[PDB]
Ligand binder design. Sequence first.
Ligand SMILES: Nc1ccn([C@@H]2O[C@H](COP(=O)(O)OP(=O)(O)OP(=O)(O)O)[C@@H](O)[C@H]2O)c(=O)n1
Ligand SMILES: Nc1ccn([C@@H]2O[C@H](COP(=O)(O)OP(=O)(O)OP(=O)(O)O)[C@@H](O)[C@H]2O)c(=O)n1
Ligand SMILES: Nc1ccn([C@@H]2O[C@H](COP(=O)(O)OP(=O)(O)OP(=O)(O)O)[C@@H](O)[C@H]2O)c(=O)n1
Ligand SMILES: Nc1ccn([C@@H]2O[C@H](COP(=O)(O)OP(=O)(O)OP(=O)(O)O)[C@@H](O)[C@H]2O)c(=O)n1
Ligand SMILES: Nc1ccn([C@@H]2O[C@H](COP(=O)(O)OP(=O)(O)OP(=O)(O)O)[C@@H](O)[C@H]2O)c(=O)n1
Ligand SMILES: Nc1ccn([C@@H]2O[C@H](COP(=O)(O)OP(=O)(O)OP(=O)(O)O)[C@@H](O)[C@H]2O)c(=O)n1
Ligand SMILES: [Mg+2]
Ligand SMILES: [Mg+2]
Ligand SMILES: [Mg+2]
Ligand SMILES: [Mg+2]
Ligand SMILES: [Mg+2]
Ligand SMILES: [Mg+2]
Lengths: 541, 541, 541
Amino acid sequence: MKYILVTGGVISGIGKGIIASSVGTILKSCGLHVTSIKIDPYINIDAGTFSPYEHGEVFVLDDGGEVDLDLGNYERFLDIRLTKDNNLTTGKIYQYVINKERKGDYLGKTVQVVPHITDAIQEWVMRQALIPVDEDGLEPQVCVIELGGTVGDIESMPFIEAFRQFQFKVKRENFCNIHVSLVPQPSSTGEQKTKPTQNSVRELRGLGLSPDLVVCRCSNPLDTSVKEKISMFCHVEPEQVICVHDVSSIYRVPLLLEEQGVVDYFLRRLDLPKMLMKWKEMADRYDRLLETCSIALVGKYTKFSDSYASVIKALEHSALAINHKLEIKYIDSADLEPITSQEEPVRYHEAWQKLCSAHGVLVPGGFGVRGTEGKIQAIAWARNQKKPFLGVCLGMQLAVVEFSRNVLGWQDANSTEFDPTTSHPVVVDMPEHMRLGKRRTLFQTKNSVMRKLYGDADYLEERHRHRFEVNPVWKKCLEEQGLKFVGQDVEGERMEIVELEDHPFFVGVQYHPEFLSRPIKPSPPYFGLLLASVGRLSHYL
Amino acid sequence: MKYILVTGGVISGIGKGIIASSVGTILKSCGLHVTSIKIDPYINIDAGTFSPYEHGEVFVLDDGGEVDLDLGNYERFLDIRLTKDNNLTTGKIYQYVINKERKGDYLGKTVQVVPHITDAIQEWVMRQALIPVDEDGLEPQVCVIELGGTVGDIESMPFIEAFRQFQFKVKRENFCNIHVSLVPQPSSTGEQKTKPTQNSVRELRGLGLSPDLVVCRCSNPLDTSVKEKISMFCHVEPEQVICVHDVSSIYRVPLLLEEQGVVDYFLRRLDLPKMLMKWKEMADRYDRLLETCSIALVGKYTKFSDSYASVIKALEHSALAINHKLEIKYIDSADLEPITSQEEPVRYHEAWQKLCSAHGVLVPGGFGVRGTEGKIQAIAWARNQKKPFLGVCLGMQLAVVEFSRNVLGWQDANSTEFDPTTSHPVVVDMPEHMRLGKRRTLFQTKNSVMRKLYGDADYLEERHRHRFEVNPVWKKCLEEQGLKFVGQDVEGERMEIVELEDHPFFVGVQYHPEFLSRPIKPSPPYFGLLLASVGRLSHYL
Amino acid sequence: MKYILVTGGVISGIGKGIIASSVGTILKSCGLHVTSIKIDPYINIDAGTFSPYEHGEVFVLDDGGEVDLDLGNYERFLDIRLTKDNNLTTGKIYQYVINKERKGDYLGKTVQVVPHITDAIQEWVMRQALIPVDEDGLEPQVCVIELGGTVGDIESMPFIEAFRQFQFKVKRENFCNIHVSLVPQPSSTGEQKTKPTQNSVRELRGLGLSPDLVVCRCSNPLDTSVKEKISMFCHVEPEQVICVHDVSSIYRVPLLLEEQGVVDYFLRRLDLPKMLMKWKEMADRYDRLLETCSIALVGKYTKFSDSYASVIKALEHSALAINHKLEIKYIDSADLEPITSQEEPVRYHEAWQKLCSAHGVLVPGGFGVRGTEGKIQAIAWARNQKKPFLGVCLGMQLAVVEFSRNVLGWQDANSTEFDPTTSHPVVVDMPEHMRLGKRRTLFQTKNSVMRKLYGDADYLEERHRHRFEVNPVWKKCLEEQGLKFVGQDVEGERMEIVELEDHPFFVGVQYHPEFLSRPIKPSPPYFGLLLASVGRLSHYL
Ligand SMILES: Nc1ccn([C@@H]2O[C@H](COP(=O)(O)OP(=O)(O)OP(=O)(O)O)[C@@H](O)[C@H]2O)c(=O)n1
Ligand SMILES: Nc1ccn([C@@H]2O[C@H](COP(=O)(O)OP(=O)(O)OP(=O)(O)O)[C@@H](O)[C@H]2O)c(=O)n1
Ligand SMILES: Nc1ccn([C@@H]2O[C@H](COP(=O)(O)OP(=O)(O)OP(=O)(O)O)[C@@H](O)[C@H]2O)c(=O)n1
Ligand SMILES: Nc1ccn([C@@H]2O[C@H](COP(=O)(O)OP(=O)(O)OP(=O)(O)O)[C@@H](O)[C@H]2O)c(=O)n1
Ligand SMILES: Nc1ccn([C@@H]2O[C@H](COP(=O)(O)OP(=O)(O)OP(=O)(O)O)[C@@H](O)[C@H]2O)c(=O)n1
Ligand SMILES: Nc1ccn([C@@H]2O[C@H](COP(=O)(O)OP(=O)(O)OP(=O)(O)O)[C@@H](O)[C@H]2O)c(=O)n1
Ligand SMILES: [Mg+2]
Ligand SMILES: [Mg+2]
Ligand SMILES: [Mg+2]
Ligand SMILES: [Mg+2]
Ligand SMILES: [Mg+2]
Ligand SMILES: [Mg+2]
C-alpha cells in the first residue's frame, strides 16, 4: 500500500477534514481504491459516551460502532463503508497496549512509549489500511491518514514519533506527508504573512517529518512572492505550495486541488497507477439555483448546529436533486410546547409561525423527556393540516403516540421512556440481546409510498441506534385505522417503518436514513419529504 | 503540603534515585515527616508482569503491591512504609482516565490529554501525598516526587505539563524543582563542559519549569569557573549549583548535600519548620573495615546483579553490624547441578570450590525448574558439612525436599511445582483465595534460635510472595526427626519458618526478610546467617 | 566543486579539527585536489590582535595573513598553501557587508541578516573554494568546511542558515554534511549513552540540515546496540554511524576513518572521481621508538602549551625522521634569569639543571622585555659549553646581543626593543614600508652548515614576522670574529641567517621555520638541531 499523512500547522480550524476528504476524492477519481483513517488524540474509546448537546452528533457504522463526525465526512466524499477502528483515538492505543501488558503478551519486559505504544500505532495503521472498505470487496491501494491536533501539541507526540519511524519501515516511494498551515493577512497592512508557517515547518522538520506538500489556508489567494518565500524556508518547490482560499461550497475544494496539479503530484511522488466532472456540475448547480423550499426541523439540540450534521447534509443532498435552494427552519420543541404560554407567549407564537410557514416538517431523534410534548403538537399539526411529514428514530415512536393519543382517543398515551405509569403504554424498552449498526428490514405490503421511494425491492439494509419499540398488543388495534406498519424485523418481532394512508405524505422510520445519504444520491426518506413538500411526488411516481 | 520535583537532564543514569533518596534523608534528618512518589513513564500497571532475568527483582509492599526497585530504595533511605500507588506508572494514569471515560464519569465531553490526563496526574499526586506513610500514623509535611526519563523525551510530556500547571494551583512557597545534569570532562582536554546542561535548562525552562537548584553529576568536583558559568545561563546563583562527584559509597551522598547547604536552602525556599551523625559514622565504618567474611549466593538469576538487589543490600546491612567486609560468592545453581559433568567438569568443579570455600550459604527465591537439583545439592552439602545455611521463599521448600529426599530416604521426593507425578509429593500449590504482601506469623515453640534472633516476641509480621506450601500429611512424619516447623500461619494452616536442631545454624523462611532490612538495622535471618558464619552467634546469645 | 560541512554536536572539544583534517587527508590520498575553510564565529578580523599568552600562537600564511592555529593544522595534514580568507571569522563577514552598505553597493534597500549576511557567507565560501591552494596551481575538486562553535549556539546561526540555503543552490550531489557528537559513558553504570546525540540531531535537523554521516567521540569503541539506536533516531544507516575512540597519536585518526569506510562513502555520496601507507608506517614508528633525546625550549610563554604549537610540532616531525623519542624540557627564561637568586635559588638552580641536562637548546620568538636576560644566559651557556643551539626570530637577535656583550666585550650591548639608551646599540627597529609573510633570502657564503641542510640551493623562500634587525654599522666588526652572517635580504639590506664557525652547531634565523614543517618532512633548522644533538650531523653530511 501507499500512505498519505495530513498534519496540522499553526492552529486547529484550518480545515484538515475537507483537505483529507478532497485528497481522498481526487484519488478516488483516478480509479484508485482509496481508504482513510482519522487519528484524533482524545482519551474517549468511542463516540457512545459523547453528549450530543456538547460534541455534536454521534455517527453510526455498519458494525454498530459509534464514531466521530469526520468518518461520516469520509463516507460522504469517498463513497465507502468504514470500520469502527479506522477511527484511532489515543485511548484505544493505550487500552490495547495495557491489555497486552496485563496478559503478559510482552514477556516480562518494561513496556515503553517509543518502543511499544509508538509501535502499536504503526501496526494498527498497517492492519486497518488493508481491510476491504470498498463495496467491490477489494484491498485498497492508498490510505489517507488524517492526524488531529497540531504539531508541537503534547497529545500529537506519540503519533508524530510513530510516523517518523513509519516512513522508513515502508519505503519512501510508499509514504508521503501533506502539511496544512494558516497564512494570516492582518487588516493593519493587508500583506500576507509566512512567518508562522516557517516556524511550523521548522517544528515538524525537527520532529523528523518533512512536508512533501504545503497547503496554505488564507482568505484571498496566495501571490507569487509568498509561494517563493514558503518554497525557500520549507524546502519544497514553488509548485508544491498549494493555496486553499475561501469558496462558496465544500464541493469546490477537490476542484482547487485538481487545477493546482495535486493529483499530478501524487501520481509521481508515490508512483501510483471523470467523477470530478459530476462534482463540478453539482458545484455549479448549488451556486445557480434560486427557486426555494423550506423545511421545519423540530429538535431539542437546535441550540447548536453539528448536533444534526448528517440530517442537514441529507436534506441538502436531497435539495440539489430536487433543484431547490433549501432553507432549514430550526425549531426548539421546548419552545413549541404549550408550557411556553406561561412564561412568554411571543416565543410560543413565533415557534408556531416558523412551523406553519414551512413547506414540510421533520422530527429527528434524541433520548430523554425535554420538549417531547412539543413534538406531539408538531405531529398533531402535521396530521391535521396535512403538510408533509417525516419522523426518524423517535419521530416514528412519537407518531404512534400522537395517533394513539388523538385518533384512538387515549388521553394518557405515552412511551415508557417518558412515563412508565400510564394506561395504554404504546412503546416499551425491548433489548436485542441496544439495537445498533446495520440490520435487515422487510416490507409487509405492496401499497406503501416508502416502498416505491426505495425502488420497490422487498427488503432494506439500514443503520439503527435505539432500544424502544411499539407494543405488539396495541399494534393489533392501531392497524384497524389509517396507520400502516409498512416494514418490520426479519420475522416480524419489531416495527421498522410506519405510514399513514389518509395523508399526502406522513411516515416514520426506526433507523437513521441520513448516514447512507451521499452528494450524488440522497437516501429515499428525505428525498420523499422534499418531493412531497414541492408537491412533485405524484408526478415522480 | 510542600512538594519537591526531581527532573533529569542530559541522559538517564546520572543518579536521580540516589539524589531523591538523599533529599528525603536530609529532610527526614530535620524531624520532618517526608513521603515520596516515583513517577516512571512505562506502560506496565505494576511490577508483577516483569521477568526477573531482564528487569531485576520485584519489590513487595505491605499491600501486596508488586512494585519497581526504586520504592525499596526509598523505604531503605527514608525508613517508611510505602503504598502501591506511590509508584505512578503512565499506564495507571491512562487506565484510570479510560475507566472514568467508559463509566461516563466525564459527562459526554471529549476527554483530552491537557485538560484531563494532565489533571488526573495532579489529583493522584495530591491524593497519594496525604496518606500516613510514617509508622507514627501522621500526615506528611513534604513530598519528594522523582520523575523518570529525561526532559524532552515524549514519555515525560504529560508529567512535565502536569507539573507546569501544578506550581500555580499549589502556591510557589509550596512547590520546588531540582534539576540533575551531566557535566562531561572529555579526556581529549580535561576541561569540564557546561554546554549540554545549558541546553537542558533552556528545554526545561521552555516547557515552563525553572530549576530552583541545579545538581551536576561529574567524576571530579566542579571548579569555581563552571559554577559561575552555570549560574549565568541557568538563572540560579553560584550557591545553587550543587556538585555530586564520585564517592566510595552511597551513604556519603546525603553528606555531600548537607555540607553544600541543600538543607539550608529548602528550609528557606519552602519555609519549612541528628540522624546524619549515625549516617556519617556508618559511612566511615564501611571505608575502614578490613576483616572479611564470604557468603555463597546460590541463584539462577546470577547472570545479572539487580535480580537480587534487596538480598545483597540485606547482607551488606548485616555485614556492617557484624563489622566485617563482605564478599558475595555468586554461584549459578545450573553450574552446580551434576549435569555440568557431561559438558565441562571444570565449570562444575569451580562452582563446588566457590561453595566449599565460603563461610556460609544462602538460597534465594525464584519460580521454575531451571537449576533446582543444584540447590538440593547445595543444601545437602550445607547439612552434611554443617556450614551455616539460610533459605528464603523456595529455600525453605527445597530444604524440606532435601531432608525428605536424603533423611527420610524418599528417592523421588520433589515439589509439585517441578514434577506433579512423584510418590511422596512433599510441597503443593495452596492458594490463599497467591499469598502476597504483609501477613502475621506465630511461633509454635520456645526452643528456636530464629525466635531469639527476632527478639523473643511470640509473633512476626512479614512480607510474602508465593503459592506453594508443605503438605500437612507428610508434615506429621518430618517432625519425628531433627527438622522443626518453628513458625506458622494464624491457626496453623501453612508452614512459615523451619529450623534443624542438629546443626549450628540451618533455617528456612517462607517470606522475604530482605524488604524489611534497613541501613541502621538488618532483618534477623540475614544477621543470624552472618553471626553463625563468623561463629559469634553463641556469644551474641 | 563538491563541499563537505563538519558541524559540532553536544559540546566543543569533541575534536572537529582532527576529524576535518582527517577527512582532508583520506580525500588527498585518493589523488583529489582538496581545499579547506575554517569558519570560527568570534568577532576578531584576524589573529594579529591575539595575546600569545592567552589564545596560543599566531600562525603566518604566505600572504602575511596572521591566522588561527587550525589553518596550520590544515597545512600540516593536507600539504597545501592556504590564503588569509580561508579563515572566515564572523567579524569579517559583518565588516564586508557593512562596507558594501556604507558604499551604497546595496541600492538604498534595508540590508538584513537572512537575505544579505547569510548570502555574503555563501558567496565567500564559493569564492575562496575555487582558488589554487595546491602547489600544482590547479583549481580544487572538494572543499572541507569546518564550522566552529556547536549547533544551537547563537553565534552559529548565520552560518547554519547559510548552509541550509547552500545545499539547494549547489545541487545535493555537490553538498554533504558530517555531524560530530559526544557519546558519554558515565562510571556510575558503564553503559554508553545516545540521548544527547539524539537531541543534537533533532536540533540540527530542525535548523534544516540532515547529517549524511554521524561521528561519535567516546573513550571506548561503540557497540552494535548503540550504532543501531543512533541509526533509528538520526535517519542514517548503522553503517553511517562512525566511531572515533581514543588512540595513541593523531596519525591514527585518518586510519580509523579509512577502515570504517568513510572514503568508500564520499566517493558515492558526492560521485567524486597510497599516501595512507606512509601515514601508517609513520604512526607505527611513533609507537615503537624507545631511544630518547631531550631539547631545552627556553621561552616566556611556557606557562601554556599551544603558545608554541608549531615549534613543538616541528621538533616532533624532526624527531621521527631522527628515529628518537623526543622530550621537550620546557624552561621559563624568567626563572633562568639571575634575579631569581634574590627570591628562591632552588627555582633558579632547577632551571639551570633542566638546561645543563638537555642534549641541545632552542630559543623561540615573542616580543617584550620579560626574561630577555635569561635568554642571554642560555645562549652564553650554549656558546661556552658547546652544546648545539638554534634561535628563531628573537633567537637570532639575542645571539648577536650575547656575542657582542661577551665576545666584543660591550657590557651594555642590547637591542633598542629592550633599551634604546645604551652605547653600542646592536639591533634597531627597521620597518619594510612590519616584515610579514613569505619573502626571499639569499646565501652569501658556500661554507655554511645551514646551506647544506637546506639542500645547497642558492636561495630560500620563508615566512617572516618581525620589525627589528642587526645594525649595518656594527655588522662590519662582528664578522671580523667567528660569527658569520650566512644569509640576507635580496640586495643585502637585512640579515636573515647567522652561524658561528667555532662551534659544533650554533645558528640564528630571522624567519619562522616551523610553519613549513610537515609530518613527512621536517624543515631544515629543526632537523639540523636534532642531528647535531644526537651527534649524527657529521655522518649525515
Ligand atoms: N467533507 C467535509 C468536511 C468537513 N465538513 C464540515 O466542515 C466543518 C469542519 O471542517 P473541518 O475540515 O473538519 O475543519 P475543522 O473541524 O474546523 O478543523 P479540523 O481541521 O481540525 O478538522 C464541520 O461542520 C464538518 O462536518 C463537511 O461538511 N464535509
Ligand atoms: N501544550 C498543549 C496544549 C494543548 N494540547 C491539546 O490541544 C488539544 C485541543 O487543540 P486546540 O483546540 O487546537 O488547542 P486550543 O488550546 O484549544 O487552541 P485554540 O485556542 O486555538 O483553540 C487538546 O486536546 C489538548 O490535549 C496539547 O496536547 N498540548
Ligand atoms: N538509595 C539508593 C539509590 C540507588 N541505589 C542503587 O543504585 C543503582 C542505580 O542508581 P539510581 O540513582 O537509581 O540511578 P540510575 O538507576 O542509574 O538512573 P536513574 O536516575 O534513572 O534512576 C541501582 O542498583 C539502585 O538500586 C541504591 O542502592 N540506593
Ligand atoms: N547561548 C550561547 C552560549 C554561548 N555561545 C557561544 O559559545 C562560544 C564558546 O563555545 P563553548 O566553549 O563550547 O561554550 P561554553 O559556554 O564555553 O561551553 P563549555 O562550558 O562547554 O566550554 C562563545 O564564542 C559564545 O559566543 C553562543 O553563541 N550562544
Ligand atoms: N590535525 C591536527 C588537529 C588538531 N591538533 C591539535 O589538537 C588540539 C585540539 O584538537 P581539535 O581537533 O582542534 O579539537 P579542539 O580544539 O579541542 O576542539 P574543536 O573541535 O572545537 O576544534 C590542538 O592542540 C591542536 O593543535 C593537531 O595537532 N593536529
Ligand atoms: N524521543 C524519545 C526517545 C525515547 N523516549 C523514551 O526513552 C525511554 C528510555 O530512556 P533512555 O534510556 O534514557 O533513552 P535511551 O534511548 O535508551 O537513551 P540512552 O541511549 O542514553 O540509554 C523510553 O522509555 C522511551 O519511551 C521518548 O519518550 N522519546
Ligand atoms: Mg475535522
Ligand atoms: Mg515580511
Ligand atoms: Mg533509579
Ligand atoms: Mg568553553
Ligand atoms: Mg580546532
Ligand atoms: Mg537507555
